[PDB]
Amino acid sequence: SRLNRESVIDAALELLNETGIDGLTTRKLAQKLGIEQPTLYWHVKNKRALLDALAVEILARHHDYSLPAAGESWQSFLRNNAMSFRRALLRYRDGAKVHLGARPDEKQYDTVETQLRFMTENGFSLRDGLYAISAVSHFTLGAVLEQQEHTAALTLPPLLREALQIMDSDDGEQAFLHGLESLIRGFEVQLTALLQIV
Amino acid sequence: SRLNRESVIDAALELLNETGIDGLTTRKLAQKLGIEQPTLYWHVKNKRALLDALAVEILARHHDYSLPAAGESWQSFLRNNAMSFRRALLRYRDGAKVHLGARPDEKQYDTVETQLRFMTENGFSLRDGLYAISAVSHFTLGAVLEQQEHTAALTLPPLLREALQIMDSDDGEQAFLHGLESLIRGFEVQLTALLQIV
Numbered sequence: 001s002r003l004n005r006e007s008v009i010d011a012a013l014e015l016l017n018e019t020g021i022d023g024l025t026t027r028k029l030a031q032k033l034g035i036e037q038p039t040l041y042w043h044v045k046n047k048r049a050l051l052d053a054l055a056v057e058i059l060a061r062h063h064d065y066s067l068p069a070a071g072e073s074w075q076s077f078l079r080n081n082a083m084s085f086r087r088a089l090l091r092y093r094d095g096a097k098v099h100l101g102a103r104p105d106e107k108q109y110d111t112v113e114t115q116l117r118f119m120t121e122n123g124f125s126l127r128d129g130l131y132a133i134s135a136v137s138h139f140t141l142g143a144v145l146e147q148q149e150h151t152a153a154l155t156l157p158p159l160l161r162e163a164l165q166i167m168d169s170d171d172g173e174q175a176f177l178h179g180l181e182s183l184i185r186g187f188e189v190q191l192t193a194l195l196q197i198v
Numbered sequence: 199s200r201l202n203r204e205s206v207i208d209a210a211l212e213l214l215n216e217t218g219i220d221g222l223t224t225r226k227l228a229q230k231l232g233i234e235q236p237t238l239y240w241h242v243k244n245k246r247a248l249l250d251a252l253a254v255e256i257l258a259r260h261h262d263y264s265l266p267a268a269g270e271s272w273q274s275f276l277r278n279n280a281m282s283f284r285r286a287l288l289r290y291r292d293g294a295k296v297h298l299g300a301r302p303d304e305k306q307y308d309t310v311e312t313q314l315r316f317m318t319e320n321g322f323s324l325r326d327g328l329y330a331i332s333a334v335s336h337f338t339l340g341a342v343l344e345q346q347e348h349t350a351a352l353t354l355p356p357l358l359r360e361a362l363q364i365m366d367s368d369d370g371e372q373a374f375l376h377g378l379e380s381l382i383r384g385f386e387v388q389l390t391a392l393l394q395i396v
C-alpha cells in the first residue's frame with residue numbers, strides 16, 4: 001500500500017489497537033502493509049522510532065486543548081489541557097505507555113514553549129509554572145496508565161471492596177476530575193501566597 | 199541454587215536491575231539461577247506471575263511508610279506515604295512499570311484497608327478519602343515513571359531549554375515535593391469546605 005509517513009502512522013495506530021504496545025512489532029507492521037521487512041525498514045528503522053512518531057501524532061491528531069483560549073484563566077487552561085491530554089492518551093490501546101517512551105519533539109517545541117510562557121505571563125516563576133504543568137502531566141499520565149496497564153494484567157476487606165466498586169463504576173473520570181481540582185486549588189493557594197508563610 | 203520463593207525473588211530483582219522490565223525473561227532467570235527452564239517453571243509459571251510477585255515484594259521490602267504513625271495528621275501521613283512509595287518505586291530499574299502491571303494483592307489487603315479507614319476516621323467520606331489516596335498514587339507513579347521510561351528511551355526554545363535544565367538538576371525530587379504539597383493543600387481546602395460553595 002502507500003508508505004508515505006501519514007499512511008505508515010495510520011497503519012501503526014490501527015496495529016497498536018489490535019496488539020497493544022508490547023505486541024506491536026515492525027514484522028507485524030510490514031504484514032499489515034503487504035510489504036517485506038526490508039521495504040518497511042527504508043521507511044521505519046525500528047520500534048523505538050515508530051513509538052516516538054506515534055506519541056507525537058497521537059497529540060497532533062487528538063489533543064486539541066494544547067493552547068489556552070484568548071483571555072482564558074491559567075486555572076481554566078490547566079483544567080481543559082489536562083482533560084484534553086487524558087482523552088488523547090485514552091484514544092489508543094496503551095496510549096499512556098506510548099506517550100511515556102518519547103521525546104518532547106521538535107514539532108511540539110513551540111506548543112510546550114507557549115504553555116510555559118502563558119504560565120509566566122500569569123504570575124508564575126518559570127520554576128513554579130513548570131512544577132504546575134509537570135504535576136498536572138504526571139497526575140494525568142498516572143491515572144490514564146493505571147486503567148490501561150490494569151486491563152493488560154487481566155488479559156476482600158469491606159472498604160477496599162466498596163472502593164474497587166467505586167473506582168470501577170466510571171473509568172476513573174470522577175476520581176481524575178476531583179484530583180484535578182484539588183491540584184489546581186493547591187497551585188492557586190501557592191501562587192497567591194507570594195512570600196507569606198502558608 | 200536454592201529455589202525457595204525469597205531466593206527466586208532475590209534473583210529476579212537482581213535480573214531486573216541488569217535487564218530492565220522489557221528484557222527480564224524466565225529464560226534469563228533460569229540461566230542466572232543455574233537451572234533448566236522446566237525446573238524454573240515448577241517455581242514460576244510465567245513473566246506475569248513473576249512481575250505480580252516483584253511488585254508486592256518491592257513494597258514489602260522497601261515501602262516502610264505504609265501505615266500512619268500514632269496520632270499523625272492525615273496531611274503528614276499522605277506526605278510520608280507518598281515519599282516512601284516514590285523511594286520504593288525508584289529502588290529498582292523500571293520499578294514503576296513493575297508496580298503498574300500488578301494486583302493490590304491478598305498480602306497487602308489489610309494495609310490498603312487501614313489507609314482507607316484512617317482517611318474516613320479523619321473526616322473524609324470513603325469516596326473523597328479514596329480520591330485523595332488515588333490522586334497521590336497516580337501523581338507519584340506518573341512522576342517516577344517519567345524518569346524511568348525517560349532513561350529507557352535514551353539507551354530548543356529558551357523556556358523549554360531552561361525547564362529541561364531545571365527538571366534535570368535533581369531527579370524530579372523538587373518538582374515531586376512541590377506538587378505533593380499543592381495536592382495535599384487542595385484536599386484540605388476540599389475537606390474543610392463541607393457543603394459550602396468553594
Ligand SMILES: CN(C)[C@@H]1C(O)=C(C(N)=O)C(=O)[C@@]2(O)C(O)=C3C(=O)c4c(O)ccc(Cl)c4[C@@](C)(O)[C@H]3C[C@@H]12
Pocket residue numbers: 059063065066081082085104108111112115130133134136137140358361362365
Ligand atoms: C499535559 N499538559 C500539561 C502538557 C501538554 O498539553 C502537552 C502538549 N504537547 O500539548 C505536552 O507535551 C505535555 O503533555 C507533556 O507531555 C509534557 C512533557 O512530557 C514534558 C517533558 O517530558 C519534559 C519537559 C517538559 Cl517542559 C514537558 C512539558 C512540560 O512540556 C509537558 C507538557 C504537557
Ligand SMILES: CN(C)[C@@H]1C(O)=C(C(N)=O)C(=O)[C@@]2(O)C(O)=C3C(=O)c4c(O)ccc(Cl)c4[C@@](C)(O)[C@H]3C[C@@H]12
Pocket residue numbers: 160163164167257261263264279280283302306309310313328331332334335338
Ligand atoms: C501510595 N499510597 C497512597 C498507597 C500505598 O501506600 C500503598 C501500600 N501498599 O502501602 C499502595 O498499595 C498504593 O501505592 C497503591 O498501589 C494503590 C493502588 O494501586 C490501588 C489500586 O490499584 C486499586 C484500588 C486501590 Cl483502593 C488502590 C490503593 C488506594 O490501595 C492504592 C494505595 C497506594
Ligand SMILES: [Cl-]
Pocket residue numbers: 001002003004
Ligand atoms: Cl508508497
Ligand SMILES: [Cl-]
Pocket residue numbers: 004005006007
Ligand atoms: Cl505524508
Ligand SMILES: [Cl-]
Pocket residue numbers: 024025026027046047
Ligand atoms: Cl519490532
Ligand SMILES: [Cl-]
Pocket residue numbers: 025027028
Ligand atoms: Cl512479530
Ligand SMILES: [Cl-]
Pocket residue numbers: 071072073076
Ligand atoms: Cl477562564
Ligand SMILES: [Cl-]
Pocket residue numbers: 199200201202
Ligand atoms: Cl531449592
Ligand SMILES: [Cl-]
Pocket residue numbers: 202203204205
Ligand atoms: Cl521463602
Ligand SMILES: [Cl-]
Pocket residue numbers: 222223224225244245
Ligand atoms: Cl518470559
Ligand SMILES: [Cl-]
Pocket residue numbers: 223225226
Ligand atoms: Cl530471553
Ligand SMILES: [Cl-]
Pocket residue numbers: 269270271274
Ligand atoms: Cl502530624
Ligand SMILES: [Mg+2]
Pocket residue numbers: 099137
Ligand atoms: Mg510527556
Ligand SMILES: [Mg+2]
Pocket residue numbers: 297335
Ligand atoms: Mg498501585
